[PDB]
Design an enzyme around this catalytic site. Sequence first.
Site, PDB file in Angstrom:
ATOM      1  N   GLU A   1       0.859  -1.168   0.000  1.00  0.00           N
ATOM      2  CA  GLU A   1       0.000   0.000   0.000  1.00  0.00           C
ATOM      3  C   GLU A   1       0.903   1.228   0.000  1.00  0.00           C
ATOM      4  O   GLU A   1       1.947   1.230   0.667  1.00  0.00           O
ATOM      5  CB  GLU A   1      -0.926  -0.012   1.228  1.00  0.00           C
ATOM      6  CG  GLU A   1      -1.596   1.299   1.579  1.00  0.00           C
ATOM      7  CD  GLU A   1      -0.985   1.935   2.808  1.00  0.00           C
ATOM      8  OE1 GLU A   1      -0.618   3.122   2.740  1.00  0.00           O
ATOM      9  OE2 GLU A   1      -0.861   1.242   3.840  1.00  0.00           O
TER      10      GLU A   1
ATOM     11  N   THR B   1       1.088  -7.335   5.845  1.00  0.00           N
ATOM     12  CA  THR B   1       2.241  -7.322   4.951  1.00  0.00           C
ATOM     13  C   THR B   1       3.511  -7.726   5.689  1.00  0.00           C
ATOM     14  O   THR B   1       4.260  -8.592   5.222  1.00  0.00           O
ATOM     15  CB  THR B   1       2.411  -5.937   4.325  1.00  0.00           C
ATOM     16  OG1 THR B   1       1.220  -5.581   3.613  1.00  0.00           O
ATOM     17  CG2 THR B   1       3.588  -5.929   3.367  1.00  0.00           C
TER      18      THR B   1
ATOM     19  N   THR C   1      -3.518  -1.628  16.382  1.00  0.00           N
ATOM     20  CA  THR C   1      -4.938  -1.476  16.103  1.00  0.00           C
ATOM     21  C   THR C   1      -5.469  -2.676  15.327  1.00  0.00           C
ATOM     22  O   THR C   1      -6.275  -2.541  14.403  1.00  0.00           O
ATOM     23  CB  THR C   1      -5.212  -0.180  15.345  1.00  0.00           C
ATOM     24  OG1 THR C   1      -4.527  -0.204  14.085  1.00  0.00           O
ATOM     25  CG2 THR C   1      -4.741   1.015  16.157  1.00  0.00           C
TER      26      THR C   1
ATOM     27  N   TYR D   1       4.863   6.641  17.096  1.00  0.00           N
ATOM     28  CA  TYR D   1       5.788   5.822  16.318  1.00  0.00           C
ATOM     29  C   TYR D   1       7.107   6.548  16.082  1.00  0.00           C
ATOM     30  O   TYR D   1       8.173   5.922  16.067  1.00  0.00           O
ATOM     31  CB  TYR D   1       5.152   5.428  14.985  1.00  0.00           C
ATOM     32  CG  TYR D   1       4.111   4.336  15.086  1.00  0.00           C
ATOM     33  CD1 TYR D   1       4.251   3.295  15.997  1.00  0.00           C
ATOM     34  CD2 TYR D   1       2.989   4.344  14.269  1.00  0.00           C
ATOM     35  CE1 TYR D   1       3.299   2.293  16.089  1.00  0.00           C
ATOM     36  CE2 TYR D   1       2.032   3.348  14.355  1.00  0.00           C
ATOM     37  CZ  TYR D   1       2.192   2.325  15.266  1.00  0.00           C
ATOM     38  OH  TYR D   1       1.240   1.332  15.353  1.00  0.00           O
TER      39      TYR D   1
ATOM     40  N   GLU E   1      29.326 -13.852  11.446  1.00  0.00           N
ATOM     41  CA  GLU E   1      29.827 -13.733  12.809  1.00  0.00           C
ATOM     42  C   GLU E   1      28.713 -13.486  13.820  1.00  0.00           C
ATOM     43  O   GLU E   1      28.889 -13.802  15.002  1.00  0.00           O
ATOM     44  CB  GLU E   1      30.869 -12.616  12.877  1.00  0.00           C
ATOM     45  CG  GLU E   1      31.757 -12.653  14.109  1.00  0.00           C
ATOM     46  CD  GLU E   1      33.040 -11.867  13.923  1.00  0.00           C
ATOM     47  OE1 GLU E   1      33.545 -11.821  12.782  1.00  0.00           O
ATOM     48  OE2 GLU E   1      33.542 -11.297  14.916  1.00  0.00           O
TER      49      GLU E   1
HETATM   50  N1  LIG Z   1       7.787   0.193  16.433  1.00  0.00           N
HETATM   51  C1  LIG Z   1       6.916   0.422  15.454  1.00  0.00           C
HETATM   52  N2  LIG Z   1       5.828  -0.406  15.309  1.00  0.00           N
HETATM   53  C2  LIG Z   1       4.936  -0.185  14.318  1.00  0.00           C
HETATM   54  C3  LIG Z   1       5.099   0.871  13.435  1.00  0.00           C
HETATM   55  N3  LIG Z   1       4.065   0.842  12.565  1.00  0.00           N
HETATM   56  C4  LIG Z   1       3.262  -0.203  12.875  1.00  0.00           C
HETATM   57  N4  LIG Z   1       3.787  -0.837  13.969  1.00  0.00           N
HETATM   58  C5  LIG Z   1       3.268  -2.038  14.636  1.00  0.00           C
HETATM   59  O1  LIG Z   1       3.059  -2.997  13.623  1.00  0.00           O
HETATM   60  C6  LIG Z   1       1.860  -3.707  13.838  1.00  0.00           C
HETATM   61  C7  LIG Z   1       0.965  -3.527  12.619  1.00  0.00           C
HETATM   62  O2  LIG Z   1       1.702  -3.843  11.461  1.00  0.00           O
HETATM   63  P1  LIG Z   1       1.881  -2.826  10.236  1.00  0.00           P
HETATM   64  O3  LIG Z   1       3.342  -2.718   9.890  1.00  0.00           O
HETATM   65  O4  LIG Z   1       1.287  -1.479  10.545  1.00  0.00           O
HETATM   66  O5  LIG Z   1       1.068  -3.527   9.039  1.00  0.00           O
HETATM   67  P2  LIG Z   1       1.733  -3.872   7.611  1.00  0.00           P
HETATM   68  O6  LIG Z   1       3.026  -4.635   7.783  1.00  0.00           O
HETATM   69  O7  LIG Z   1       1.968  -2.604   6.823  1.00  0.00           O
HETATM   70  O8  LIG Z   1       0.661  -4.863   6.920  1.00  0.00           O
HETATM   71  P3  LIG Z   1      -0.811  -4.418   6.439  1.00  0.00           P
HETATM   72  O9  LIG Z   1      -1.106  -2.986   6.795  1.00  0.00           O
HETATM   73  O10 LIG Z   1      -1.801  -5.335   7.110  1.00  0.00           O
HETATM   74  O11 LIG Z   1      -0.902  -4.581   4.947  1.00  0.00           O
HETATM   75  C8  LIG Z   1       1.231  -3.148  15.096  1.00  0.00           C
HETATM   76  O12 LIG Z   1       1.578  -4.007  16.156  1.00  0.00           O
HETATM   77  C9  LIG Z   1       1.918  -1.817  15.295  1.00  0.00           C
HETATM   78  O13 LIG Z   1       2.041  -1.516  16.667  1.00  0.00           O
HETATM   79  C10 LIG Z   1       6.196   1.714  13.573  1.00  0.00           C
HETATM   80  O14 LIG Z   1       6.360   2.659  12.801  1.00  0.00           O
HETATM   81  N5  LIG Z   1       7.102   1.482  14.588  1.00  0.00           N
HETATM   82  C1  LIG Z   2     -11.966  -4.175  17.320  1.00  0.00           C
HETATM   83  O1  LIG Z   2     -10.710  -3.812  16.817  1.00  0.00           O
HETATM   84  C2  LIG Z   2     -10.731  -2.847  15.796  1.00  0.00           C
HETATM   85  C3  LIG Z   2     -11.859  -2.036  15.594  1.00  0.00           C
HETATM   86  C4  LIG Z   2     -11.856  -1.089  14.570  1.00  0.00           C
HETATM   87  C5  LIG Z   2     -10.715  -0.934  13.731  1.00  0.00           C
HETATM   88  C6  LIG Z   2      -9.606  -1.722  13.938  1.00  0.00           C
HETATM   89  C7  LIG Z   2      -9.612  -2.686  14.976  1.00  0.00           C
HETATM   90  N1  LIG Z   2      -8.407  -1.579  13.072  1.00  0.00           N
HETATM   91  C8  LIG Z   2      -8.485  -0.833  11.829  1.00  0.00           C
HETATM   92  O2  LIG Z   2      -7.554  -0.702  11.107  1.00  0.00           O
HETATM   93  C9  LIG Z   2      -9.879  -0.206  11.528  1.00  0.00           C
HETATM   94  N2  LIG Z   2     -10.671   0.068  12.674  1.00  0.00           N
HETATM   95  C10 LIG Z   2     -11.601   1.189  12.636  1.00  0.00           C
HETATM   96  N3  LIG Z   2     -12.309   1.391  11.526  1.00  0.00           N
HETATM   97  C11 LIG Z   2     -13.174   2.398  11.421  1.00  0.00           C
HETATM   98  C12 LIG Z   2     -13.957   2.561  10.120  1.00  0.00           C
HETATM   99  N4  LIG Z   2     -13.378   3.259  12.400  1.00  0.00           N
HETATM  100  C13 LIG Z   2     -12.697   3.138  13.567  1.00  0.00           C
HETATM  101  O3  LIG Z   2     -12.697   3.852  14.718  1.00  0.00           O
HETATM  102  N5  LIG Z   2     -11.848   3.353  15.610  1.00  0.00           N
HETATM  103  C14 LIG Z   2     -11.256   2.285  15.073  1.00  0.00           C
HETATM  104  C15 LIG Z   2     -10.206   1.458  15.812  1.00  0.00           C
HETATM  105  C16 LIG Z   2     -11.786   2.103  13.717  1.00  0.00           C
HETATM  106 MG   LIG Z   3       0.131  -1.438   6.352  1.00  0.00          MG
END
Ligand SMILES: Nc1nc2c(ncn2[C@@H]2O[C@H](COP(=O)(O)OP(=O)(O)OP(=O)(O)O)[C@@H](O)[C@H]2O)c(=O)[nH]1
Ligand SMILES: COc1ccc2c(c1)NC(=O)CN2c1nc(C)nc2onc(C)c12
Ligand SMILES: [Mg+2]
Lengths: 437, 328, 54, 427
Positions: A71, A145, A179, A224, A254
């Site tokens: 993405e 991902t 999230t 982050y 190593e």
């Molecule tokens: N330390 C750190 N953790 C991150 C960061 N961004 C996301 N996370 C953690 O990564 C997890 C979510 O994975 P993401 O990397 O956001 O998702 P992705 O790998 O892009 O995969 P998709 O969005 O599902 O396509 C959650 O546990 C977040 O707390 C970051 O910038 N730093």
């Molecule tokens: C029960 O766990 C989850 C519940 C909802 C979400 C997610 C996890 N994670 C996501 O990426 C999208 N998401 C949301 N979507 C939308 C349309 N409005 C939202 O308002 N607050 C959140 C958080 C949220």
């Molecule tokens: Mg992502």
Amino acid sequence: MRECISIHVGQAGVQIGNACWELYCLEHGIQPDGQMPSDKTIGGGDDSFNTFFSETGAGKHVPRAVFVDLEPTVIDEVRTGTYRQLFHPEQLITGKEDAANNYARGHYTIGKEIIDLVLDRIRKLADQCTGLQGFLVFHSFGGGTGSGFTSLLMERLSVDYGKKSKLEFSIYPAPQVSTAVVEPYNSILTTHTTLEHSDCAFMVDNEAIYDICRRNLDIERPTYTNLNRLISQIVSSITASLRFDGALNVDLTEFQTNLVPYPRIHFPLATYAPVISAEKAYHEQLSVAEITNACFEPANQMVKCDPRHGKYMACCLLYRGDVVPKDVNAAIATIKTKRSIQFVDWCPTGFKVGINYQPPTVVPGGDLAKVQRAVCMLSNTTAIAEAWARLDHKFDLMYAKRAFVHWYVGEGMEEGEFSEAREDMAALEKDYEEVGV
Amino acid sequence: MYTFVVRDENSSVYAEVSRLLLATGQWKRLRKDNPRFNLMLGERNRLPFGRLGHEPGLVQLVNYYRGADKLCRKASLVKLIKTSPELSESCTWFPESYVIYPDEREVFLAAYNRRREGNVWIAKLISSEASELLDFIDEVHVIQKYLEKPLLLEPGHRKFDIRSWVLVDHLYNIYLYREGVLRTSSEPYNSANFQDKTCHLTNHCIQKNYGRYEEGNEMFFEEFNQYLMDALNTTLENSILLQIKHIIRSCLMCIEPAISTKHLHYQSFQLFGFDFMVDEELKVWLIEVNGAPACAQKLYAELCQGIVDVAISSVFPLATSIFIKLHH
Amino acid sequence: MEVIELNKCTSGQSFEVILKPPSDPSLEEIQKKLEAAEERRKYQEAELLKHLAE
Amino acid sequence: REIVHIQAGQCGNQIGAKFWEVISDEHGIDPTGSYHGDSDLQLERINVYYNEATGNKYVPRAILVDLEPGTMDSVRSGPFGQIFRPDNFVFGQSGAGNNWAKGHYTEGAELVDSVLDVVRKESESCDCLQGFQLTHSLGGGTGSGMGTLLISKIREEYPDRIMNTFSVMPSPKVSDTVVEPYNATLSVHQLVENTDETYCIDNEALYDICFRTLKLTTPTYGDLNHLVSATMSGVTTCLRFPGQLNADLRKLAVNMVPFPRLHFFMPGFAPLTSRGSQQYRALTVPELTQQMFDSKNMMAACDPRHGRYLTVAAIFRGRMSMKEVDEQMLNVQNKNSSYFVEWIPNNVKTAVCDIPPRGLKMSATFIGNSTAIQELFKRISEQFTAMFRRKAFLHWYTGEGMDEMEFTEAESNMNDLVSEYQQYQDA
Ligand SMILES: Nc1nc2c(ncn2[C@@H]2O[C@H](COP(=O)(O)OP(=O)(O)OP(=O)(O)O)[C@@H](O)[C@H]2O)c(=O)[nH]1
Ligand SMILES: COc1ccc2c(c1)NC(=O)CN2c1nc(C)nc2onc(C)c12
Ligand SMILES: [Mg+2]
Ligand SMILES: Nc1ncnc2c1ncn2[C@@H]1O[C@H](COP(=O)(O)OP(=O)(O)CP(=O)(O)O)[C@@H](O)[C@H]1O
Ligand SMILES: Nc1nc2c(ncn2[C@@H]2O[C@H](COP(=O)(O)OP(=O)(O)O)[C@@H](O)[C@H]2O)c(=O)[nH]1
Ligand SMILES: [Ca+2]
Ligand SMILES: [Mg+2]
Ligand SMILES: [Mg+2]
């Protein structure tokens, strides 16, 4: 000189790569446009920083990195950020729709569409290498991902680069900043498919980095950006030996030789000190002993666990700053008498020490104060199995009801891969307990 | 409100702690497998310490010290005393002990041969011939010097052991409950045969002559102190309790670096049962430490109330002390 | 404490302190598993379109 | 990541027209499609709901459907009527007569293919289409009968896109005809199979909130739609605005729906406000959290204490302490942990957006996937059986070709939905 290629997958991987490569440029004196005045060998060279940077005829120093996200919005910030000139557009790869926090969507459905593209972009950096030694892979366990596409990438890298080492920097899931509710599913699935393809993996629990930011940086709600700047410091400590003159951990091989005697148990625990707030007006600089002593405090580890109730197989101390061997031995002598440090019987009890005289570099305007000396300890303790226990418990709770399984099966995955993956984690948890009774 | 869970239905002490907590109106009990708890009254075996202290917004506390089994297993306690310099091999208050696997076997036989030139040992069951005890073991054990000249209460010529209950809070304060109990033998001490062991084993389960001298073969400090004054012209504080306080403090200060939760993401407290043995010369010997002890019925109400005040309410406060703090 | 293999340079030093001595899948198999999953997606989509046709 | 909006029927177009009024004001778009705002946050994700036309105009990606011209003429005359692309108005003339069969099998069949041509035209212009959101009532004929025919046909042509609905449940407290339990039961059968996420907006709950809480003695549909448009604004905040979480419809479904059929959400909102009256005391974060979980703020007349929360999403709008939000949100979970399933760890996720809705300094929107929503389907199933055991009013439907067997099947499938929700209420 042997080159290393970094690969950043998913949001967490890309954003942490941004942090690390910004830090690398500051440490090596590389401007955001890629220029490096201190480099007198124009157009090439086999210095230690050339492990991570290639050179152009005009003098630009380009990272040996590739960013890949399913993405675009995260890598698009790199394409327009402060270091936009640094990277060639071909090593910034974006899809159009993400994996939706779904391992099976990132591994099977979408991953199949883009795996061949990334592998050829990775091939374009490998051809620029006179002696490639392997890859450093940055990703999250919980992302669709970061978990799904990385395990597919790790599988193919073993095929196309069999003689090569592969090191992981993995972000362990933490509910305070995640999230997604299905992160335990993605974490177990990706660990099962990647385990035999990774030679050494450094886990980073976001819960540990989060608390360090609250306790020692006085940041009420860490972002982050706060976490990633701190993580990049640890990563920089770990990679510094590959980018600088020295005799400890000079190649990726190593790392496995010094830290991983058992192939499956390849998750070293990282501890870092000191983390000092840049807003602190008055600060007393800590000694070699004080910061070496802080390496055995659980509140400073990248994963919260208790090494007193485990056993060590290996232990590295990586110092940055005003440190001399005399003070290290004096500090290790005191600490050994006051702490529960127990090695497995078939391992020598001791420490491999590396000292880099250049003090740690902090980004201007960041949260970390500049210190006179810092240390990163890499210790392969069986106490890190606590993190697997936590993860597998959460996995077992959800899977017992088959909650959210339909999302993965609907992507072509079979329900058996869940139990197959969980069985492997059950075996991994058992190996740790054998070694550390 | 505060929240707690119960994962050991067999615990008589913490069953009373559950009731007292609910009666405050500020503690609510959850189901065993609910992670959103403040307090865990955990199981005795395979307690999941690795899952504690990872719930955001919850200060978590547990009624056991991870690693305390090194003090509450007979094999571990011997190894801890012989290897730790704080206690050393020349520890004056622990009986000669050797670990035998069905091992220091050859080092033990060297002592028994110098004992051939009082050679009654216990294996944990009593014997005078070293070969007989070893034949029993095979059919892990520790052999220990059986104290042949114990202090005998009169009237009765009776053996006994002293149990002290010690509470250690999250700050690693060491609290010795002022009320102990003497677990007495109702049958006179016979030194001529050790196969009949109802006059030697002071355990309550062995006492099936039960209850002749005192109720339940239990003598509390009120009576035992009065006896020591009338009989031996001394007090319980001077003659016995100083050594008990010294032993309790020495054992716990030794393992403090290995079990303390001062800088941890969760906290621990634990109630211990120290078992002592007094000899003919008013010298106290440590027999063992019990990691999950039970109390005496007369003292359940007062002790369990003190566990709440000192170990639980000190971390989760609400809306004369019965303990002696052992200073370190 | 024995200090061994001490190496020094302008950037820093390294050494080792000892306190006590001691006491897969092929590209073919990857392509098949990825196609087996795509087959299962196409079967579940056909069953859906067959259900909608009814 | 574009979304295609569809509004069908009287109720569908009235709440749909209100939705576009509310969010157009939030994004700074005027009734002519011209942007006259101040912050660039208003346009960073404007493409999710708006197409960019000639002259830097913003046209809603909305399709307006009805079998009568009456309500849609009112929409075109309304305050924001001119913002809608005129070609996206698709309407017949006969009406549906509050008859699910007319909308689904006869009258609506004539019209559905022309709706799908407009849907196809909007989808072919999409960079990467996430999916569709539909607004409709389940008690009428067009929104209920044709709306579910549309959803079935959209899934046939776009089987890998997300289908999201805002479905208004009938209630005898606000009743047009006696045949509403028939239409609702027939429609829920479709929603169970052909949607990924359904926001259950119960007209009973909207009436009680207007009566008991807002102190409105005789609520109108305008008073009910004020609560709907506020809820619809809140639940789409993370789709329309940039933040920590740039959410889409699929990630919402993946994390909220642990079992495919159990995708019926209870919306909630705080603070509850009546239109034309502004309260001047901003709420504290402890107050937003307490009220958004209160049953008196739920838009589906269900007692959440009679079930257990499978998943919960919470979205806070305004400038507030994100630390205080975390403490208060964690305080609700730790203090009522019995009502959250233990077998889905950390099932409450929170989002924060800095832009508050119009007329409020701080607000909070709640999306709950609770097993207590079976109470809603139980209520409609009781009213259904009360008439069906005597085959009463069935001639309206059998005259349009339907058989009693189809009613029996629909009753059963909903009774299965109720028992499935009861399965996880005990586990
Ligand atoms: N330390 C750190 N953790 C991150 C960061 N961004 C996301 N996370 C953690 O990564 C997890 C979510 O994975 P993401 O990397 O956001 O998702 P992705 O790998 O892009 O995969 P998709 O969005 O599902 O396509 C959650 O546990 C977040 O707390 C970051 O910038 N730093
Ligand atoms: C029960 O766990 C989850 C519940 C909802 C979400 C997610 C996890 N994670 C996501 O990426 C999208 N998401 C949301 N979507 C939308 C349309 N409005 C939202 O308002 N607050 C959140 C958080 C949220
Ligand atoms: Mg992502
Ligand atoms: N070295 C010794 N000398 C004399 N008597 C001894 C002894 N060791 C043990 N005993 C006797 O054995 C009895 C029981 O032994 P022990 O206390 O080790 O078993 P146990 O652990 O099953 C009971 P508890 O756990 O309640 O303390 C003691 O009460 C004591 O009288
Ligand atoms: N909340 C709300 N409900 C409505 C509105 N208009 C109609 N309804 C409800 O919807 C049902 C009538 O369906 P309707 O949409 O008018 O018929 P249709 O045009 O054939 O779909 C009844 O239960 C009404 O209470 C409205 O503006 N708001
Ligand atoms: Ca050069
Ligand atoms: Mg015992
Ligand atoms: Mg109507």
